[PDB]
Design a binder for these strands. Structure first.
Ligand SMILES: [Mg+2]
Ligand SMILES: [Mg+2]
Ligand SMILES: [Mg+2]
Ligand SMILES: [Mg+2]
Ligand SMILES: [Mg+2]
Ligand SMILES: [Mg+2]
Ligand SMILES: [Mg+2]
Ligand SMILES: [Mg+2]
Ligand SMILES: [Mg+2]
Ligand SMILES: [Mg+2]
Ligand SMILES: [Mg+2]
Ligand SMILES: [Mg+2]
Ligand SMILES: [Mg+2]
Length: 121
RNA sequence: GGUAUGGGAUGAAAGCGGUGAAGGGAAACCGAGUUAACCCCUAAGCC
């Protein structure tokens, strides 16, 4: 796996992240795309950052795991950038997504954030 | 008067697009549509 993927995410945990992006897209507020996502982290707005595992070249999202740790924002890995874009509701792949307002997925992103803080070790 | 290189509508079993479309900007900022015939609006420039 790429060098920016720092920990293994179980399959059903990545599905919860995808499910959280869809629910937040419908009932809350998200940012999709690495530029919008990065700014959401720099500005302290992101409640959860979702990063695709198949980003090539890696340098597009390699800055995100360190930036999220500095800003105290949890992040989780997801296997497919195309599947992440669909979860964000766009016709194209998304290398990264940031959930700003989780909406009805607030409890879900919070269960993800706790186990992700674990997986950060 | 003609004329779009400017637009509106349309935009597919087609192309491109969050690895950033189109449009604006010196940049920051923007952040999901868009590409072309026909139809429709406009006529700076050109005839
Ligand atoms: Mg799926
Ligand atoms: Mg005329
Ligand atoms: Mg007239
Ligand atoms: Mg007239
Ligand atoms: Mg147009
Ligand atoms: Mg169709
Ligand atoms: Mg095809
Ligand atoms: Mg299409
Ligand atoms: Mg144009
Ligand atoms: Mg531009
Ligand atoms: Mg006219
Ligand atoms: Mg004229
Ligand atoms: Mg002449």
């Amino acid at each position: 796996k790429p060098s920016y993927v720092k920990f293994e995410v179980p399959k059903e945990l990545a599905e919860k992240a995808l499910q959280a992006v869809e629910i937040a897209r419908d009932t809350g507020k998200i940012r999709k795309g690495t530029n919008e996502t990065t700014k959401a982290v720099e500005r302290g707005q992101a409640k959860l950052v979702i990063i695709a595992e198949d980003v090539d070249p890696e340098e597009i999202v390699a800055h995100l795991p360190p930036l999220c740790e500095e800003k105290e924002i949890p992040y989780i890995y997801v296997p497919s950038k195309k599947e992440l874009g669909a979860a964000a509701g766009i016709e194209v792949a998304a290398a990264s997504v940031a959930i700003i307002e989780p909406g009805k997925a607030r409890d879900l992103v919070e269960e993800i954030a706790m186990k992700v803080r674990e997986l950060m070790k």
